[PDB]
Amino acid sequence: AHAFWSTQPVPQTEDETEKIVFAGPMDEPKTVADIPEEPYPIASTFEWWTPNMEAADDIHAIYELLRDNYVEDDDSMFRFNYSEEFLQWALCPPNYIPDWHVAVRRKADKKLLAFIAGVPVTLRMGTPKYMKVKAQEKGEGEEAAKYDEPRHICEINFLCVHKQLREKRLAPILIKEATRRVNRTNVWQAVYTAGVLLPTPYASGQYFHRSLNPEKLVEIRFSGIPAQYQKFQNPMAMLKRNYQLPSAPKNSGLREMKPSDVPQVRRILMNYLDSFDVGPVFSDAEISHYLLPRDGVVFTYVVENDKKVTDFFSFYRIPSTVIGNSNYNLLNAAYVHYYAATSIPLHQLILDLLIVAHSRGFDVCNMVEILDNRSFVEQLKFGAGDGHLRYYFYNWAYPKIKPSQVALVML
Numbered sequence: 001a002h003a004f005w006s007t008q009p010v011p012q013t014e015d016e017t018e019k020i021v022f023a024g025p026m027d028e029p030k031t032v033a034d035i036p037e038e039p040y041p042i043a044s045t046f047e048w049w050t051p052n053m054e055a056a057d058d059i060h061a062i063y064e065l066l067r068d069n070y071v072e073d074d075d076s077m078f079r080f081n082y083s084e085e086f087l088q089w090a091l092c093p094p095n096y097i098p099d100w101h102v103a104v105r106r107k108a109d110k111k112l113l114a115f116i117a118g119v120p121v122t123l124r125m126g127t128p129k130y131m132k133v134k135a136q137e138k139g140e141g142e143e144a145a146k147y148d149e150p151r152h153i154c155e156i157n158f159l160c161v162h163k164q165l166r167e168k169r170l171a172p173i174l175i176k177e178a179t180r181r182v183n184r185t186n187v188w189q190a191v192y193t194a195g196v197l198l199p200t201p202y203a204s205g206q207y208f209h210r211s212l213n214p215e216k217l218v219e220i221r222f223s224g225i226p227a228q229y230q231k232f233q234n235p236m237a238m239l240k241r242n243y244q245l246p247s248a249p250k251n252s253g254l255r256e257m258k259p260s261d262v263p264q265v266r267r268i269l270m271n272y273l274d275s276f277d278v279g280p281v282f283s284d285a286e287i288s289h290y291l292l293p294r295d296g297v298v299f300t301y302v303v304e305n306d307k308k309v310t311d312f313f314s315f316y317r318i319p320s321t322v323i324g325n326s327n328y329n330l331l332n333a334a335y336v337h338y339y340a341a342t343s344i345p346l347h348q349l350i351l352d353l354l355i356v357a358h359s360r361g362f363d364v365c366n367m368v369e370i371l372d373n374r375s376f377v378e379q380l381k382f383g384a385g386d387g388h389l390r391y392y393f394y395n396w397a398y399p400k401i402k403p404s405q406v407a408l409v410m411l
């Protein structure tokens with residue numbers, strides 16, 4: 001029973017999703033003119049607010065709402081503490097639409113109560129390869145290729161309702177209003193991820209974690225000491241030793257990315273991403289925005305052996321408030337972002353990622369089993385966590401695919 005999701009243009013059950021063969025819209029074509037010009041109705045103690053994303057104070061207000069009310073684990077140990085600079089970066093990519101950032105405020109005192117954000121993404125979302133092959137056996141290639149062109153769509157993130165306003169059906173209202181503002185700009189599909197199960201994922205993958213500071217992670221109970229370590233005289237010394245890393249990167253040529261790297265980086269990234277069924281298409285402007293280093297937010301390194309860039313890796317920072325332990329304020333996580341390797345094995349590229357993230361004081365390295373992330377798990381000592389990232393479309397019928405056919409990283 002989903003009183004809201006049952007009303008929406010999404011597949012309704014797993015069985016429906018495993019029955020789908022081609023990519024395409026769920027809904028009837030609609031027009032910009034068809035869409036209400038007036039904001040969705042909301043109780044008169046509240047108003048809609050469109051925050052200004054290049055205004056430091058508005059960023060601050062969104063920052064605080066998320067700090068106190070955004071994602072926690074189920075045991076209330078950690079809550080995301082995305083920084084202000086991270087939010088400006090995430091919410092203001094090139095050609096972003098200010099209207100797509102949707103907030104609810106109390107009319108009386110302008111207190112922020114809820115938020116949802118949309119940003120533009122150019123995404124390949126045509127029929128996956130194996131379904132195309134089948135359609136070609138059967139003379140249905142035309143139907144299977146109809147939506148192969150990259151689509152300019154919306155990416156949803158940062159949905160948050162204040163803790164005091166939970167389970168008052170406010171999330172559906174935020175989602176309806178976001179949908180309206182995006183539809184008004186002639187966009188009819190969206191992509192979103194969630195740690196929770198909703199109708200209905202097109203792909204789902206486990207989270208993986210690479211301990212960088214194991215003693216801190218045990219202390220805060222992000223991690224436990226596995227039971228075989230108890231046969232050691234000093235469990236923690238064995239644990240520290242098991243996860244230890246060099247201080248200096250191993251690849252010669254490794255340096256930080258710079259603006260003149262953009263075209264080379266774009267080329268090797270796009271060549272690599274194009275091999276997945278679902279992936280973003282990036283302009284020079286978007287490579288520069290999503291990958292150029294920004295202090296405390298995104299860290300990007302290239303391999304340049306012979307004034308020629310042949311590999312790169314990137315990671316981003318999300319700290320979490322450590323809610324139940326007084327000895328630490330923040331767990332500092334580094335998230336594996338985009339990468340491409342043409343001159344060295346991927347496990348060797350990513351070892352340097354761990355080395356850099358460790359030397360910069362990160363506690364853990366996190367990723368989902370999308371891209372070729374499975375390919376270096378065992379050797380680099382990542383372990384699976386209890387979490388899953390699920391990938392969804394809005395108003396797009398899509399076959400169930402494996403997470404290793406997904407090339408879209410979500411922030």
Ligand SMILES: CCCCCCCCCCCCCC(=O)SCCNC(=O)CCNC(=O)[C@H](O)C(C)(C)COP(=O)(O)OP(=O)(O)OC[C@H]1O[C@@H](n2cnc3c(N)ncnc32)[C@H](O)[C@@H]1OP(=O)(O)O
Nearest residue numbers: 002003004005070071158159160161166167168169170171
């Ligand atoms: C064309 C463009 C279209 C754009 C729109 C695309 C669709 C985008 C969809 C959004 C993608 C966001 C991606 C991310 O940001 S995922 C991260 C979501 N944020 C958090 O988890 C932060 C902490 N939690 C909260 O702030 C609240 O619990 C939220 C706001 C999540 C729910 O508020 P509350 O707990 O006060 O509940 P309600 O009484 O208001 O509403 C209950 C309804 O909400 C459905 N629900 C619960 N969680 C989610 C969820 N994560 N995505 C979609 N729907 C969700 C739920 O099944 C139920 O519907 P139904 O089962 O009765 O049918």
Ligand SMILES: Cc1nn(C)c(C)c1NS(=O)(=O)c1ccc(NCCN2CCN(C)CC2)nc1
Nearest residue numbers: 071072073078079080193194195320387410411
């Ligand atoms: C360290 C930490 N902080 N927080 C808030 C959590 C849940 C953790 N633990 S964790 O193992 O790193 C982890 C576990 C599960 C998880 N789930 C995905 C939540 N979604 C992340 C991506 N986003 C676009 C939608 C929300 N993300 C992170």
